[PDB]
């Protein structure tokens, strides 16, 4: 509401691969820091 | 059950009141690991 859309990202680590938690073990990171961009649907270069 | 990444784990009266905890209760360290599983 209010146009304050919230985008949720589940981090994926290249070194591990597309790991899926198994045996009740949380997916590992080790990818350091990744910033996930959001592309506005109306405009190719996101206004924001 | 308290597993703490931090070394210090101060106990509280309320837990002892709610259940039963001995004052000189023996504590056995179980090395649960965030990275893996208990070690």
């Amino acid at each position: 509401g209010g146009g304050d859309t919230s985008l949720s990202w589940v981090p994926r680590s290249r070194l591990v691969g597309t790991t899926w938690p198994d045996n009740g073990a949380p997916i590992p990171s080790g990818e350091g820091l990744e910033r996930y961009q959001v592309t506005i649907g109306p405009t190719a270069a996101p206004v924001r | 059950v308290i597993l703490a990444d931090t070394p210090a784990a101060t106990y509280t009266a309320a837990e002892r009141a709610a259940d039963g905890i001995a004052a000189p209760f023996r504590v056995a360290v179980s090395q649960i690991s965030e990275t893996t599983g208990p070690g």
């Binding site: 589940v10 899926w20 938690p21 949380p26 997916i27 | -």
Partner: protein, 212 residues
Amino acid sequence: GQHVTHNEALDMIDALAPRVVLSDSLATPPPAPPDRSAWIVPPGGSGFGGAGPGQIALRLGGVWHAITPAQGARWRVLDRGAAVIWSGTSWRPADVALGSTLGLATIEATVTATGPSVTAPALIPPRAIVLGVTSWTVQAVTGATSYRVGVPGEPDKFGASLGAAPGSSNIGVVGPFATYAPTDVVVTAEGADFTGGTIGLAASVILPGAPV
């Protein structure tokens, strides 16, 4: 699981399952469609259900997920009462409704046949349409050439010369007429001894115009 929640799977389960769907046909989906119920967005629907108008918006956790229907996707439209199996190109209605549900009571019975004339005990319920009379033969009927299954005094209503042999299935329709009125289906025989034989008899009992 954590990555894919059991809830994600459960929501998927409702969507995958054929669902009673309310084709109110409102351009805008209602503010509170029932949870775990898909309110179908009409094609050309405005505002909410904007994705894929003509898809079914299923409310899970207050979020309406428009499910893209696939080949033979059956969604029973509550408002119409028809179960619409969307072909894939578009909605395709089933051949029928008004909340009328066709109640069925099982009457398959083995009528031991003794003597040429035996009486079936499967009296129809009052106001119950009979699509057809179901006939089977369970045990060898000895000396039997024909089965005059039908209303007592008028065995002609159902076939009056059905096959009369062990294991013979004489399943059939009692014409285009559906017999709402309660009736027995006496298993008479055309000069055929029925002794030593058993008959499996049912009469498609349907109670139409019965509320859910």
